[PDB]
Symmetry: C2
C-alpha cells in the first residue's frame, strides 16, 4: 500500500510534481507508470547533484505484494523504497566520489580528457560553435556556485550546484519555522533551548520526540537539493547566446527550487 507515498515524499525532496497516486488508482499501463517513474527519478537526481549523472537510473514497480518500487542503476537492482530513505542515501553515498575539493570527481561523459578550462574567454566559444563532444571541468563561478557543461551528440547541457547538505537545509527551515511560530512566549522558550540543542533539537522537543522519532523516517532529512541541469537538443544548441541563457536559467532555477524546498520543509516543520 505505502510504496506510492514513500516515492512521492522522496520526489518531494525536489521540485518533483509526482502524480503517481492519480494513475496507480486509474489502472494506468504498468510500462507507462514505470516510464514516468524513471523520468521523475532522473530529474530528481539532476536536482540532488550526486555527480552520478554518468549512470542510468530507472525505477520499476514490483509484481508481487506488498508492491514496492525498485530503484535500478544500469538495469541492475540497487535499492527499494521499503528500505527507508537513510539506507537509500548511504547506498548512493557509496557511489559518489569527491575530488581534492568538496566536488564530484566523476564527470558525465565516458572517461577521457575532461576539459581543463583553466583561464580564457573564447576558450569555450570554439566548443559551443565547433565541437562534437566534450565536457569541462568545474568552473569556479564567483557567484557562490560551481558550474560545468558538456555536450553529447545534438544535446547540450549545463549543470550548476552549490555545495550543500541536508543539515544546512534543516538549519534554514528550522530557524524559519521558529520565526513563523507567532507565539513570542513559546518561541522564546524554544529559542532558549536552541542554545544547547540547536534549532532542530528544540523543534523536536516541542513535538514530544527524543531524537526525531518520525524524522529519521522522512526523506528530507538527507540528500537535500543542491544542483540543477539545463539541457537543449535542437538547432539553438550551438548559438552560444543560448548557452549564457541556459546558465542564467540554471542559476534562477537553482535559487528558486532550493527556496521552494525550504518553504515546504519549514511547512512540515510546524506539524
Amino acid at each position: 500500500e505505502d510504496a506510492l507515498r514513500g516515492f512521492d515524499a522522496l520526489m518531494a525532496t525536489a521540485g518533483v510534481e509526482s502524480t503517481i497516486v492519480k494513475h496507480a488508482a486509474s489502472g494506468a499501463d504498468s510500462q507507462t507508470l514505470n516510464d514516468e517513474l524513471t523520468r521523475s527519478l532522473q530529474l530528481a537526481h539532476d536536482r540532488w547533484g550526486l555527480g552520478l549523472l554518468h549512470l542510468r537510473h530507472e525505477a520499476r514497480l514490483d509484481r508481487g505484494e506488498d508492491t514496492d518500487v525498485i530503484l535500478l542503476v544500469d538495469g541492475r537492482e540497487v535499492a527499494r523504497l521499503s528500505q527507508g530513505a537513510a539506507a537509500i542515501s548511504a547506498t548512493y553515498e557509496t557511489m559518489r566520489a569527491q575530488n581534492a575539493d568538496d566536488l564530484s570527481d566523476w564527470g558525465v561523459l565516458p572517461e577521457g580528457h575532461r576539459v581543463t578550462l583553466k583561464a580564457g574567454n573564447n576558450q569555450m566559444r570554439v566548443l559551443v560553435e565547433d565541437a562534437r563532444d566534450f565536457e569541462t571541468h568545474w568552473s569556479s563561478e564567483r557567484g557562490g556556485a560551481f558550474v560545468r557543461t558538456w555536450r553529447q551528440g545534438e544535446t547540450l547541457a549545463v549543470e550548476v550546484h552549490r555545495p550543500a547538505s541536508p543539515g544546512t537545509a534543516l538549519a534554514k527551515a528550522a530557524w524559519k519555522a521558529i520565526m513563523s511560530i507567532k507565539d513570542r512566549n513559546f518561541q522564546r522558550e524554544l529559542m532558549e533551548r536552541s542554545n544547547s540543542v540547536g534549532m532542530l533539537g528544540a523543534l523536536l522537543g516541542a513535538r514530544h520526540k527524543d531524537a526525531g522519532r518520525a524524522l529519521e523516517r522522512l526523506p528530507e532529512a538527507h540528500f537535500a537539493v543542491r544542483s540543477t541541469v539545463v539541457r537543449m537538443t535542437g538547432g539553438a544548441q550551438r548559438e552560444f547566446d543560448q548557452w549564457r541563457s541556459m546558465v542564467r536559467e540554471g542559476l534562477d532555477q537553482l535559487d528558486e527550487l532550493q527556496k521552494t524546498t525550504t518553504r515546504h520543509l519549514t511547512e512540515i516543520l510546524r506539524h
Copy 2:
C-alpha cells in the same frame, strides 16, 4: 598465378613496398598475408585521396584457383584484381563524390557538423588542446594544397592533397621520358609528332602501339597519387606543435612521393 604481380603493380602506383611475392612463396599464414594486404591497401588509399577514408578497405586471398585477390569494403566483396585496373577505378569512382569545388564532399567521421573553420587562428588551438572528436572542412592552404584534419579518440590525423589526375602524372612523366632519351634525332622526331598526338601519343607510337595496347592493362594509367595522411596516437596528440609538425611532414611526404611516382612512371615509359 598472376594475381600477386597485379596487386604489387597496383600498390606500386603509390609508394607501397609490397613484398607479397616473398611471403606467398614462403608458406606464410593466410591470415597474416591478408592482414598485410589490408594494411597495404589502406595506405594505398590514403595516398590516392579518393575521400573514401570513411570506409573499411580490406583485402583477401581466394581459396579456389586461379587464386585472386578480393577487394572488400566494410566486409562486402567489391572488386577483384583479375578485373583489370580500369574497372577497379570506375568502381571506386562510383563511390567518390565531390562538392561545389573539385574536392571530396565526404568527410571522415560519421556525418554531422564538420567544422566550418571559416577564418581565425586560435580557432583550432582549442580543438587540439581541448576536444574529443571533430573534423574540419577543407583548408584552402595557400601553398597550392588543400588540407583538413580530424581526431577519433586518442588518434589525431591530418590529410593533405593536391587536385591531380593520372593524366597530369603522365604528362609530366612522358615529357621527362622524352627528355631522357639522349638521342636528339629520334627525340626530335617524337617531339615533332607530339604536336598532334601529345607526349603520350608520341611515346606510344615509338613502341609499336595503336592506342596504348599494354597501357590500358597497367595501373598507373589511372588513380595517380594525390594525397597523404599523417596520424599519431599517443601523448603528443594534443601538443599542437606536433600538429604543425605533422602538417610539415605531410607536405614533405606528398611532394616526395609524387616525385617518386613520376620517377618510376618515367622509368617504365622508356621500356
